[PDB]
Design a protein around this nucleic acid. Structure first.
Ligand SMILES: [Mg+2]
Ligand SMILES: [Zn+2]
Ligand SMILES: [Zn+2]
Ligand SMILES: [Zn+2]
Lengths: 34, 49, 46, 48, 115, 49, 67, 52, 96, 258, 427, 240
RNA sequence: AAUUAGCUCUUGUGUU
């Protein structure tokens, strides 16, 4: 179902998930590993 | 044998790869250290993109 | 005469004479830390 | 020296309260901005 | 590096007079008291008490520099009343004030502690 | 550096969500040294076959 | 790093309330209620405990330099 | 001079109880670097007491 | 402001009323993309907010588009300082 | 030209604070009493630290600074001790200092909490505030870490260092209803009533009094635990009186020679 | 709601960001493809049914405040400031004193600064949750009052509370590491760590060598100052003194000494010396909104103005710093600090929220017995009299920049000379 | 090459002849001080004790110079070198024999900088003539340069990390030149635009605007408190 | 009384 106006929680949950999956130095580590 | 290549810290070929925070603390390595830099002559070097 | 050094790994105090290789008796470590001075130290609580 | 020593009695500051209108000037500002937007839209459509 | 020691705020060194009097030459019956190693704590009360006296034409105090621990009090009184006796009368009045207040506080503390 | 050109130093419109619009040195290299945004990522590359 | 002994602004002892603050927090108390139950009225003291990070706990994880 | 390089303790005055190291001294006074403060002071030898 | 110690009338206007139009190189915000300043707008939009007009005040806060436009406007001041200092120092040296 | 007659009324008295009201005195006297409350009240605090072995995660100066801020119960020893600058002795004697010792070693795997009860005083009448809620935490030690030190505590007041500040908070206030217009509210309807306001809920501030002077000062002195608040007030009054008396003696000496 | 639920119970199940990508909900758009797409700033506001503007959106932003960088995302209410102020704050955030790493006790780094009591900001952005700022903060929440007290803070300067500083406020410690190794300089030239003796050295100054022990090295805990030898190194020609010296005007305490062998097996020692720094006047302090300043004077607690209770400002800043610099975000952060402290919860200053504004914060503050605009009635510290103008005051997060005055004071009177042109040296 | 050694900037002509590094110079951070006159600069004790000034011995001032030489280089108001008229210099940091401490008429003493000394105060972006004015030294406890606020405008100073430079003239002729030419009060009006370069800035201006309003009234006590701060007051209280 | 060249980063001037 849609998320009407209860959207700040989801908006920051997705960002927290992103930053848990990928850190802050992802580009350098990925480039060196490749 | 060809030569030695420095390794970016916290990479796939770094000794500190996938270790838990307990192991890092046991190795006197901060778990909050982001890695992503080389150690040349004991100095931390970073590459600007 | 001897200088007391502390190993970084096994923490065991070991004595090394001057002009000797820097190595721990066990665990073969290379890094040694010097012990605290024996002279008095006074700090004002300010 | 004299003015600085009198300022110890008078005092001087700046805060949030000095950046607030009377809620009636806000209406005037909003109406002016709306009129400007309508005028610009009219000019744009007349150009079109 | 250049930090002054804390005790310099209140300790007198060798050759330092606690209080110095200089007779002002601009107007008659005017004098300057130079108190060393003090601050507004004494200056404010001394000035207030001097102002309470109806025989004082002028009573003021100032700290020349907040980093220099000294205050200057200027007192000018009517003729037949030297500023020195005005200053010492103010000090006596302050002493009486504080002693009376202290004993009244003692009595009231006793009263509170005994219902 | 020390170049009279000013167009590369400016903040282009296309630097939205890619580069921080506020973090830059204030010395002689203003606008020439930049920082990645929070969610920005850099492609590592792949075979086109 | 460690909880200061005294509040910076007024000087009230606040160094003996960190453990009590943690206990109240783990006892399902809101931060404000825990702070006012610890007798912290002025907000100068409240910010001392509310906005404090205890880095000594992370420091104690590292092995001692000498044993 | 005997006093140079000696760990001294100030015995009198406002600086009573502070230990330090004498750097330069004369027949009247001495210069002491303090262990507790990042400054060097000048103190009379009458207020000084060598410790160890 | 009336004492002249600091600030001006436009400062009060921007703090309370409205920040106003942002300008780069003396003109409105250019079409950095193809016929639009930002992807959030449609192609060939010459409206006020689309080309870099800030309708909010510093008290009310800036929306993301006008925030980025304000950053664009403010960059030019630092750039102009960094180039003008070195440009005018040489002129002054030649004069002296 | 003579001193006025103040009156005192204590409205609350506990083991931590004293609230009272002073009447028939000038503002200068009230403010100076406040400043003497904060700054010039003698009290006992640690001022000399010697560390024998510190293997903690905090360096020596950090430990000394934390120790200096620990309050010590000094209620009657304050007037009995002498300032270390005035005591004619070599090395701190018990007449001008109090000795503390600390020796903590963490052997068990559990963390050790070096707190104030680990300070061992040699004088029963001067101890940290643990006479009768945990302690002021000093250090946390891991296994194999030790801390051995000895300290001397001396006498001083807050003007030298804030560790000798006895008061935790002085809530000075006069004229709760703005009758004297000492402060001007641009919109008086936007301000909360004062705690000591004898004003009805209708109006915000009292009518102007053209001929009036500050009176009826309200104090709420809250102590940090070393001196009892009533003792704080009494000692401050005595100290201010003594300073004035010394000034009077110096003035008399200066005048009798001039 | 299905994806949001599954992502909420993550780290229990195995749903993650990569699974969100595989479901075809988010997509990586590069700057070249951004040219041909249509972004909606926020879902609810820019995708409902109103006056038809576009109605053909293809993508939506996750959160607008993700356009900022690492340093710029720690600014509270950055959309209320002037852009150059945000740039200055982004620059000065990299100079703020604080715990740069947890294991700073093992790293023999050069020029390490670390503060005693860092504090989590009372008002924070959500973005800095992922920057680990709540776990390694740099700065302290201080009761800042914006007023002109005496005139010692008139032009971008601040007045500090001396009594607060005595209680460890902004006190810090600065480390410095010296490295030195013995090397085979030649067949006849060979350095060695050994205490020089007054009977075997030709080239030698009055430098005292009894401070260091017989191993040729200083001992930890030994107080050192300028022109003191730490490592006694003498090289044979009888010998030439090549011993290292402490930098002029340092005056620290030897923190630790480490001895080992380099890659080629020679002895090599690194020595770390610490020094306690007190916030004296001349030290540089900066806010989170580009309001940098230097301490002008320090007043004790009795001298500073006070509220109805015994609350006194820790730092007083001049009003004139505000109007010309458009740091309204600084004022808003100060106002919300009072609400956060009284209510007892860390406030939120996300750059683009629309759920937080000045009116709601003022209404919240009015419930705790304070003025809704944050003003308070201050009493003069010296005379005890009320100030006719109510003073804005509240808790604000300040940082201590690394630029201390003692590292910049310098003077010369006929010192060393250059070799090519006989002129005074540089530095 | 030899051409590169003197070609342009950092060369001999521009980097070593038209501009050199000079002795008797100091550089520190500046902080405000409203309790100093516009022609005064507050310097720390360490800088004053580090850089010295040479004074000729005369019968008028032989006792003071002898006392300063006796004080040595440890105590601040002392000396550092004593230069004999035959060109020989004796260092006072090595505590020499008391025979050398004896000084006669023709000698020179390098005494520490004291109160009243004339210095040149400079901010590096020297744009106009008023960026190198002259000031009188006053010793102050902490380690920053303190100067009056009204003189922050000609220097374009900001008190937010700015560092300024102090040069100490080493001769009587130079001191007289600076005193009669480049002192601060002598440079209030600029020739560039025949108008003052020094005004009332910051909160003093705001407070003087609020203070001269029609509705500002003062009681006797505050009037006396304010009159205590007038240097040129004649001691007469005006009729209210 | 113990050297230099190069590079990098950073500080102040970014006001109306
Ligand atoms: Mg500046
Ligand atoms: Zn070992
Ligand atoms: Zn508090
Ligand atoms: Zn004794």
């Amino acid at each position: 179902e849609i998320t009407p106006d209860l959207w700040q929680e989801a908006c920051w949950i997705v960002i927290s998930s992103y930053f848990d999956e990928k850190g802050l130095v992802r580009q350098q580590l990925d480039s060196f590993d490749e | 044998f060809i030569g030695k290549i420095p390794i970016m810290l916290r990479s796939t070929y770094c000794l500190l790869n996938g270790l838990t925070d307990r192991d890092l603390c046991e190795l006197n390595e901060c778990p909050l250290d982001p890695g992503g830099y080389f150690i040349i002559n004991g100095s931390e070097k970073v590459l600007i993109a | 005469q001897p200088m007391i050094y502390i190993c970084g790994e096994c923490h065991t105090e070991n004595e090394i004479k001057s002009r000797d290789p820097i190595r721990c008796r066990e665990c073969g470590y290379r890094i040694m830390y010097k012990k605290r001075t024996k002279r008095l130290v006074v700090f004002d609580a300010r | 020296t004299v003015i600085n020593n009198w300022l110890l009695i008078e005092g001087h500051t700046i805060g949030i309260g000095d950046s607030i209108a009377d809620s009636k000037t806000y209406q005037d500002i909003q109406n002016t901005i709306k009129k400007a937007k309508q005028d610009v839209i009219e000019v744009i459509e007349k150009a079109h | 590096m250049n930090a002054p020691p804390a005790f310099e705020s209140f300790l007198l060194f060798e050759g330092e007079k606690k209080i110095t009097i200089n007779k002002d030459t601009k107007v008659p019956n005017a004098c300057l008291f130079t108190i060393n190693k003090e601050d507004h704590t004494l200056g404010n009360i001394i000035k207030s008490q001097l102002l309470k006296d109806p025989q004082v034409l002028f009573a003021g105090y100032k700290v020349p520099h907040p980093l220099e621990h000294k205050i200057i009090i200027r007192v000018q009184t009517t003729p037949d009343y030297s500023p020195q006796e005005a200053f010492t009368n103010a000090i006596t009045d302050l002493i009486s004030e504080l002693s009376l207040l202290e004993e009244r506080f003692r009595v009231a503390i006793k009263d509170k502690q005994e219902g | 550096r020390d170049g009279k050109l000013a167009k590369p130093r400016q903040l282009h419109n296309t630097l939205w969500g890619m580069v921080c619009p506020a973090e830059t040195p204030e010395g002689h290299a203003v606008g020439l040294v930049k920082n990645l945004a929070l969610m920005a990522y850099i492609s590592v590359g792949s075979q086109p076959s | 790093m460690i909880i200061p002994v005294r509040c910076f602004t007024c000087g009230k002892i606040v160094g003996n309330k960190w453990e009590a603050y943690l206990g109240l927090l783990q006892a399902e108390y809101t931060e404000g209620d825990a702070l006012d139950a610890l007798g912290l009225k002025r907000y100068c003291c409240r910010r001392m405990l509310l906005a404090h990070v205890d880095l000594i706990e992370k420091l104690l994880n590292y092995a001692p330099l000498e044993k | 001079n005997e006093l140079i390089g000696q760990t001294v303790r100030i015995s009198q005055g406002p600086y009573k109880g502070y230990i330090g190291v004498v750097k330069d001294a004369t027949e009247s006074t001495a210069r002491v670097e303090l262990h507790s403060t990042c400054q060097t002071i000048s103190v009379d030898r009458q207020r000084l007491t060598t410790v160890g | 402001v009336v004492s002249g110690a600091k600030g001006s009338k436009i400062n009060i206007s921007q703090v309370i009323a409205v920040v106003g139009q942002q300008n780069v190189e003396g003109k409105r915000i250019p079409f950095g993309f193809k016929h639009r300043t930002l992807p959030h707008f449609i192609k060939d939009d010459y409206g006020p907010e689309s080309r870099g007009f800030v309708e909010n005040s510093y008290l009310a806060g800036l929306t993301p588009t006008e925030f980025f436009f304000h950053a664009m406007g403010g960059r030019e001041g630092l750039i102009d300082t960094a180039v003008k200092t070195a440009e005018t120092g040489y002129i002054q040296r030649r004069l002296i | 030209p003579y001193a006025n007659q103040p009156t005192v009324r204590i409205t609350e008295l506990t083991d931590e604070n004293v609230k009272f009201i002073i009447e028939n005195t000038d503002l200068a006297v009230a403010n100076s009493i406040r400043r003497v409350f904060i700054a010039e009240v003698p009290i006992i605090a640690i001022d000399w630290v010697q560390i024998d072995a510190n293997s903690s995660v905090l360096h020596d100066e950090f430990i000394a600074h934390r120790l200096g801020l620990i309050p010590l119960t000094s209620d009657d020893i304050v007037d009995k001790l002498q300032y270390s600058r005035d005591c004619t002795c070599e090395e701190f004697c018990p007449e001008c200092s109090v000795e503390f010792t600390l020796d903590v070693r963490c052997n068990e795997d559990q963390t050790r909490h070096v707190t104030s009860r680990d300070l061992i005083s040699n004088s029963p009448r001067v101890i940290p505030v643990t006479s009768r809620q945990d302690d002021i935490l000093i250090v946390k030690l891991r296994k194999g870490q030790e801390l051995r030190l000895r300290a001397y505590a001396k006498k001083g007041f807050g003007k030298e260092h804030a560790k000798w500040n006895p008061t935790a908070g002085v809530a000075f206030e006069y004229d709760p209803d703005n009758a004297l217009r000492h402060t001007v509210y641009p919109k008086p309807e936007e301000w909360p009533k004062s705690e000591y306001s004898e004003l009805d809920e209708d109006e915000s501030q009292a009518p102007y009094d053209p001929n009036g002077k500050p009176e009826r000062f309200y104090y709420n002195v809250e102590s940090c635990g070393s001196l009892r608040p009533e003792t704080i007030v009494l000692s401050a009054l005595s100290g201010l009186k003594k300073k004035l008396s010394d000034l009077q003696t110096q003035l008399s000496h200066e005048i009798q020679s001039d | 709601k299905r994806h949001i639920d599954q992502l909420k119970e993550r780290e229990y199940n195995n749903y993650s960001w990569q699974d969100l990508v595989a479901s075809g909900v988010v997509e990586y758009i590069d700057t070249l493809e951004e040219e041909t797409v249509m972004l909606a700033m926020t879902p609810d506001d820019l995708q409902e049914k109103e006056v038809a503007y576009c109605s053909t959106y293809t993508h939506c932003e996750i959160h607008p405040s993700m356009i900022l960088g690492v340093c710029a995302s720690i600014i509270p209410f950055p959309d209320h400031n002037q852009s150059p102020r945000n740039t200055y704050q982004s620059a000065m955030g990299k100079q703020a004193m604080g715990v740069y790493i947890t294991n700073f006790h093992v790293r023999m780094d050069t020029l390490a600064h670390v503060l005693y009591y860092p504090q989590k900001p009372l008002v924070t952005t959500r973005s800095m949750e992922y920057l680990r700022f709540r776990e390694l903060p740099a700065g302290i929440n201080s009761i800042v009052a914006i007023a002109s007290y005496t005139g010692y803070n008139q032009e971008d300067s601040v007045i500090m509370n001396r009594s607060a500083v005595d209680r460890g406020f902004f006190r810090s410690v600065f480390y410095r590491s010296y490295k030195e190794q013995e090397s085979k300089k030649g067949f006849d030239q060979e350095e060695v760590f050994e205490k020089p003796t007054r009977e075997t050295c030709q080239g030698m100054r009055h430098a005292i060598y009894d401070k260091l022990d017989d191993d040729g090295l200083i001992a930890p805990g030994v107080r050192v100052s300028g022109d003191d030898v730490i490592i006694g190194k003498t090289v044979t020609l009888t010998k030439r003194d090549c011993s290292t010296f402490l930098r002029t005007s340092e005056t620290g305490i030897v923190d630790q000494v480490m001895v080992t062998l380099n890659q080629e097996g020679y002895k090599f020692c690194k020595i770390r010396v610490r020094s306690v720094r007190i916030p004296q006047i001349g030290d540089k302090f900066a806010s989170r909104h580009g309001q940098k300043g230097t301490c002008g004077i320090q007043y004790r607690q009795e001298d500073m103005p006070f509220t109805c209770e015994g609350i006194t400002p820790d730092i007083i800043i001049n009003p004139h710093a505000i109007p010309s610099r458009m740091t309204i975000g600084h004022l808003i952060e100060c106002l919300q600090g009072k609400v956060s402290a009284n209510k007892g919860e860390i406030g939120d200053a996300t750059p683009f929220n629309d759920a937080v504004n000045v009116q709601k914060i003022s209404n919240l503050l009015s419930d705790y017995g304070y003025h809704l605009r944050g003003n308070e009635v201050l009493y003069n510290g010296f005379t005890g009299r009320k100030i006719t103008s109510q003073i804005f005051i509240g808790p604000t997060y300040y940082q201590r920049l690394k630029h201390m005055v003692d590292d910049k004071i310098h003077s010369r009177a006929r010192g060393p000379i250059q070799i090519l042109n006989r002129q005074p040296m540089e530095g | 090459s030899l051409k590169q050694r003197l070609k342009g900037k950092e060369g001999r002509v521009r980097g070593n002849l038209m501009g050199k590094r000079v002795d008797f110079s100091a550089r520190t951070v500046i902080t405000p001080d409203p309790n100093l006159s516009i022609d005064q600069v507050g310097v720390p004790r360490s800088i004053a004790a580090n850089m010295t000034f040479a004074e000729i011995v005369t019968p008028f001032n032989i006792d003071r110079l002898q006392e300063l030489v006796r004080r040595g280089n440890s105590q601040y108001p002392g000396a550092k070198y004593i230069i004999r008229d035959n060109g020989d210099r004796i260092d006072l940091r090595f505590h020499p024999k008391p025979s050398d401490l004896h000084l006669q008429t023709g000698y020179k003493v390098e005494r520490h900088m004291c109160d009243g000394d004339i210095v040149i105060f400079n901010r590096q972006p020297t744009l106009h003539k008023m960026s190198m004015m002259g000031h009188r030294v006053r010793i102050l406890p902490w380690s920053t340069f303190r100067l009056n606020l009204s003189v922050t405008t000609p220097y374009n100073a900001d008190f937010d990390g700015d560092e300024m430079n102090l040069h100490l003239p080493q001769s009587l002729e130079t001191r007289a030149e600076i005193q009669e030419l480049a002192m601060v009060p002598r440079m209030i009006v600029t020739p560039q635009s025949n108008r003052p370069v020094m005004g009332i800035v910051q909160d003093t201006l705001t407070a003087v605007r609020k203070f001269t309003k029609r509705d500002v009234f003062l009681e006797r006590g505050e009037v006396m408190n304010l009159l205590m701060f007038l240097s040129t007051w004649d001691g007469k209280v005006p009729q209210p």
